[PDB]
Amino acid sequence: ARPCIPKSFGYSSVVCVCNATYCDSFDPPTFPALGTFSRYESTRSGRRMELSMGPIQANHTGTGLLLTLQPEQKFQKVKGFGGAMTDAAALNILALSPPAQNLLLKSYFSEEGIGYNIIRVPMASCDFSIRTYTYADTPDDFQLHNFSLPEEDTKLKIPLIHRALQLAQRPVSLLASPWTSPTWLKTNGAVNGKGSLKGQPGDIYHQTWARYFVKFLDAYAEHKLQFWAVTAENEPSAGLLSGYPFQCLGFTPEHQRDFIARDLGPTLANSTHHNVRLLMLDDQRLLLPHWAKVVLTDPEAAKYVHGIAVHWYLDFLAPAKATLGETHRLFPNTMLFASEACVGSKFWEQSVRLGSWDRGMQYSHSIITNLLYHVVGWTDWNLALNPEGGPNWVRNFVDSPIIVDITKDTFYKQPMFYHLGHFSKFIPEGSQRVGLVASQKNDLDAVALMHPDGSAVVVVLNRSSKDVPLTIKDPAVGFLETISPGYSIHTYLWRRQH
Numbered sequence: 001a002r003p004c005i006p007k008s009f010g011y012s013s014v015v016c017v018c019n020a021t022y023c024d025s026f027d028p029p030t031f032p033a034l035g036t037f038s039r040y041e042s043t044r045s046g047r048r049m050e051l052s053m054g055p056i057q058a059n060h061t062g063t064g065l066l067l068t069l070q071p072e073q074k075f076q077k078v079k080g081f082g083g084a085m086t087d088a089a090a091l092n093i094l095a096l097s098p099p100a101q102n103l104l105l106k107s108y109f110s111e112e113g114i115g116y117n118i119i120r121v122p123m124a125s126c127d128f129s130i131r132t133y134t135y136a137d138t139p140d141d142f143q144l145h146n147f148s149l150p151e152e153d154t155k156l157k158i159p160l161i162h163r164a165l166q167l168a169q170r171p172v173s174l175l176a177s178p179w180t181s182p183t184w185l186k187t188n189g190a191v192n193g194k195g196s197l198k199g200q201p202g203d204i205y206h207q208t209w210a211r212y213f214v215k216f217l218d219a220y221a222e223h224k225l226q227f228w229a230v231t232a233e234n235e236p237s238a239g240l241l242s243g244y245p246f247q248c249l250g251f252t253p254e255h256q257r258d259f260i261a262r263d264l265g266p267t268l269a270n271s272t273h274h275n276v277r278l279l280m281l282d283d284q285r286l287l288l289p290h291w292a293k294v295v296l297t298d299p300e301a302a303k304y305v306h307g308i309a310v311h312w313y314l315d316f317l318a319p320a321k322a323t324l325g326e327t328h329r330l331f332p333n334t335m336l337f338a339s340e341a342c343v344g345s346k347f348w349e350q351s352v353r354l355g356s357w358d359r360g361m362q363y364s365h366s367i368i369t370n371l372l373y374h375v376v377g378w379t380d381w382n383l384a385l386n387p388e389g390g391p392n393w394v395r396n397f398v399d400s401p402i403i404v405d406i407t408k409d410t411f412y413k414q415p416m417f418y419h420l421g422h423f424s425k426f427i428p429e430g431s432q433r434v435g436l437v438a439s440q441k442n443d444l445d446a447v448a449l450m451h452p453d454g455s456a457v458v459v460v461l462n463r464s465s466k467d468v469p470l471t472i473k474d475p476a477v478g479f480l481e482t483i484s485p486g487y488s489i490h491t492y493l494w495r496r497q498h
């Protein structure tokens with residue numbers, strides 16, 4: 001529909017420049033003719049989700065790499081993809097002119113963009129906020145009569161969420177997560193630092209905290225917003241750490257288990273919001289499987305927990321098989337969901353690297369890795385940041401797929417945007433991962449899924465410098481002869497006749 005306007009900032013690849021009168025966009029989505037496949041290609045050399053079509057062939061010869069679709073080998077259903085509407089994201093989006101705001105939101109939420117269907121909503125303030133607040137800062141208000149949404153919600157976040165939902169043709173699911181409780185419920189009486197809820201699960205402090213979740217859901221419902229899920233606490237391990245710099249609330253896994261069993265589970269289940277799902281953990285993967293064991297082996301907690309939320313700090317190394325793999329083996333009926341991912345968080349790397357292909361490859365490699373370990377969705381962190389990677393009240397700056405430059409009324413779409421879009425645009429909610437078997441050892445990363453309507457999607461990432469010819473075999477349908485260029489990502493789509 002409209003191609004990428006590239007700009008280089010001296011990193012390995014380009015950003016696409018958008019402004020008040022121009023942004024890259026796709027045509028309305030249409031499938032290739034039966035017997036035809038679509039290929040969307042992005043490359044370090046500068047291609048951005050460019051469309052080509054090719055024939056599906058009856059025959060194949062050669063000893064080249066063959067990836068054979070296993071359409072009846074079924075794995076997880078996919079919930080979807082999206083990102084977080086933090087205070088920082090909202091402020092950056094609304095600092096753009098109305099036309100640029102629209103093109104940014106269309107980029108993410110419309111069918112002319114990459115089709116996000118998840119928005120994560122912080123419950124009150126976090127690090128990506130410029131003001132520290134909760135919804136119930138008046139002390140000793142245990143019945144939460146003075147609970148209320150401030151302007152960060154009513155004037156910034158909620159109107160933007162409504163605008164995203166208007167642009168979306170896919171149903172959008174909202175996920176809520178709190179960072180801190182009111183300080184008068186906490187052992188340290190501060191939003192940050194080491195501290196937990198006072199007392200013990202089942203007591204007034206814990207009951208009040210559980211009621212705060214229902215108050216939040218009630219308040220958003222008055223604005224005609226309903227949630228798909230809540231997490232039990234953002235990064236519960238953080239509040240156990242001396243000097244933790246920003247909003248947190250510490251829970252051991254035993255504390256989280258008992259809070260869920262005695263307070264949050266029953267309180268949600270007794271409310272009009274009983275259909276909202278509860279996700280546990282919302283933290284880094286090295287806490288698994290231990291955290292899952294502690295919480296889910298208690299039947300009283302387990303009956304309230306619908307899923308496990310995991311965060312991915314892509315700058316840091318940690319095992320996948322010993323964490324996600326083991327958790328799936330031990331608790332195959334509890335879904336895993338990636339609720340936050342980010343890059344650029346190390347103090348010694350530029351928070352925002354405009355045009356970094358490497359950071360793009362980190363996003364897509366992460367997503368593939370998550371999907372191969374049974375995870376049902378993937379949620380980026382801040383939807384948009386400034387060129388510093390902010391604002392952020394403790395200067396904990398990071399990268400974002402969209403960077404806003406208010407002085408030019410411009411925003412920049414990073415390689416990370418396109419790497420995420422290779423999945424989000426082409427994997428509708430309810431898609432199911434299926435097998436994909438390589439005929440020989442190779443350097444590629446790939447995943448295959450089947451749409452609800454039976455159509456096929458395959459994503460192929462090449463993190464190597466070498467162009468790799470390959471064939472995809474769909475045993476019902478035929479062969480797709482293609483090539484995976486070095487430093488590329490491709491998405492393949494086709495109809496499957498039986």
Ligand SMILES: *[C@@H]1O[C@H](CO)[C@@H](O[C@@H]2O[C@H](CO)[C@@H](O)[C@H](O)[C@H]2NC(C)=O)[C@H](O)[C@H]1NC(C)=O
Nearest residue numbers: 002005006017018019020021022023408409410
């Ligand atoms: C928004 O960006 C577009 C794209 O760069 C700008 O339009 C370009 O303007 C230059 C300079 O006049 C021309 O050489 C290009 O041909 C234009 N491209 C297109 C596609 O129109 C546009 O001026 C910018 N808008 C604002 C309000 O700054």
Ligand SMILES: *[C@@H]1O[C@H](CO)[C@@H](O)[C@H](O)[C@H]1NC(C)=O
Nearest residue numbers: 055056057058059060061478
């Ligand atoms: C495909 O395979 C068989 C090989 O004998 C042949 O009958 C057929 O003509 C070949 N070519 C095409 C285009 O199908």
Ligand SMILES: *[C@@H]1O[C@H](CO)[C@@H](O)[C@H](O)[C@H]1NC(C)=O
Nearest residue numbers: 211266267268269270271272
């Ligand atoms: C359960 O729900 C009702 C609302 O119908 C409420 O009045 C009651 O206090 C709730 N019980 C709790 C939160 O324990």
Ligand SMILES: O=S(=O)(NCC1CC1)c1ccccc1
Nearest residue numbers: 029030031111425426427428
């Ligand atoms: O994968 S999709 O079906 N994504 C969803 C779209 C609304 C139908 C698709 C198909 C054709 C072109 C782009 C994307």
Ligand SMILES: [K+]
Nearest residue numbers: 135146147148
């Ligand atoms: K208040």
Ligand SMILES: [K+]
Nearest residue numbers: 344346349351
């Ligand atoms: K940094």
